[PDB]
Amino acid sequence: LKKMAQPSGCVERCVVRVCYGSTVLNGVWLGDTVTCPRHVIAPSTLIDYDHAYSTMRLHNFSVSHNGVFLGVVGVTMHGSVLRIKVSQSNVHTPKHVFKTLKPGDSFNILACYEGIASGVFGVNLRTNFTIKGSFINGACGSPGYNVRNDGTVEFCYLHQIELGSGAHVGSDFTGSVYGNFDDQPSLQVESANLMLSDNVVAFLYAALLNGCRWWLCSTRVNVDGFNEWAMANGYTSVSSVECYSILAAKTGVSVEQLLASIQHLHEGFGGKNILGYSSLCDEFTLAEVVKQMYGV
Amino acid sequence: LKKMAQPSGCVERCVVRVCYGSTVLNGVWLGDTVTCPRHVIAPSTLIDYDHAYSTMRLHNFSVSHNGVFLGVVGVTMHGSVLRIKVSQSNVHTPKHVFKTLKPGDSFNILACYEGIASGVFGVNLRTNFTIKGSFINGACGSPGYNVRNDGTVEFCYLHQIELGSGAHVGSDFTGSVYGNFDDQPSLQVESANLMLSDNVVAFLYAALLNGCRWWLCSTRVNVDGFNEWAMANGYTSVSSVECYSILAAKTGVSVEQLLASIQHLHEGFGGKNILGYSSLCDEFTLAEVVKQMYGV
């Protein structure tokens, strides 16, 4: 079990550099539209974006891909993003949709600087709607994506800000900020994360499939009992036993046995480890475990 | 800190599917040459590769890029790889070199199946010359690479085998197997992994720069003394001190203090953690720490 990213080639071909005056960040070029964070039009300064938008000048923009400049034709503002119409369509536009992530969803970040990709990594949207990425100044507008089995790219995230805690906040392509954080320099404090119980169950199945079984409780707790316990101990509710059927069928271990195991392991591993982890891991989804173990 | 891969697009355009008889793995297409593990010509049985090569027939090969089949013109064997000449050059061959890794080198893996990339991740060549990837059956031939600052791709790894431990072994593009394992289905056991001290020093500097300093020793241990201790305690030598000077200056902490700190912490943290880790982390190189925190 290793956190991986899906290959980045099809997304690299969509990253552009967006400049407005002296401010530079990343945008995503699809068809004849570049989407980027609206912070690119912020003054050097609480930002009044409505006023910055009303006094915008199109000739103040510079949009470029690999040093080649695209002609800017028009700009509209949608929530926390801009949609910049350009006079040229991206001939490497992949088959794509736009998807809004939910907590517990895994996705890929292509970390970009000045319109050029530098790194790719997998992340999980947490219950407080932040991610734990690695970004420095200039990463604003870095895209997050998933690639479906048929090849369709789901565009799901545009990087916005780093919180005081180090957590990372982005928007979707409609302009909604995940978690409704402000795209402003401010002292906002995210609420505390819960452990993603769905991912912990997937992790324990992966441990069973790698021979690691010292932790397995003999007895069971049902979903209703676990969910009552989860609410009192910083865990999310578990969603439907039936979705784990493939891993339950391959291990002979029911979800209820793992729910009971989580209750035990919450109080500590006691000098032992599970796949090299010293506490429970909610980093991997059921789909990731199934893909990495079986290719499905 | 996040382990990440460099963008994979330029390598994706070189991945091919190589088939000989019923055996299918991955290769890398550069110019008019495909390099792949020689296991593709193994019979279905201790493999006599010299005999398999002498009886090889070019018509048994099939080589394709994204489902487009390439004509096979000639084949030579070089150590544990084949060099397959095809009837056209890859028009997307990136500027590139071949480089043989040394233990402690980080690089990127593009995990491929049937000539199609499915995931990308960063790894470190360990002192026992294995890596800890995530690979299932069909990953043979998956390439490892690094991208230089000037854009030159260093091709450095072709995936070969998974040992009983789960550890992964590959070759370089000259055909030398890392660690001189055999490209045979025999039982082989790698030597004990040593903690990469250079990476642990980088990790402790990252902690200091993040305000985590509960563990810091005022004691100093010089390089020579640390290296003698390291021998007897599962650690590599520390290679040098001066490369850390930028981080030593920002923190006011000498490398020799961090060597003393490693000796203080090598058995465990008690109940405490460092950047979320419950034991010392050797995942991150100095270059990665400096790049991810300062963009250098």
Ligand SMILES: Cn1cnc(Cn2c(=O)nc(Nc3cc4cn(C)nc4cc3Cl)n(Cc3cc(F)c(F)cc3F)c2=O)n1
């Ligand atoms: C450490 N870190 C991790 N993620 C981030 C994201 N991020 C960013 O990359 N850049 C930001 N400010 C800018 C400065 C610029 C200087 N030039 C020349 N051009 C610049 C462009 C930007 Cl966007 N910010 C700050 C920030 C970005 C916003 F979108 C926002 F609404 C409020 C903010 F305070 C930033 O967080 N940094």
Ligand SMILES: Cn1cnc(Cn2c(=O)nc(Nc3cc4cn(C)nc4cc3Cl)n(Cc3cc(F)c(F)cc3F)c2=O)n1
């Ligand atoms: C679980 N895992 C992780 N990494 C690996 C690497 N690996 C591999 O992907 N495939 C292998 N055997 C093949 C079977 C095939 C069936 N078909 C239809 N085509 C096949 C092609 C291969 Cl290569 N092996 C085994 C292996 C591969 C070698 F290169 C070698 F020299 C000896 C070996 F025993 C394998 O390890 N599996």
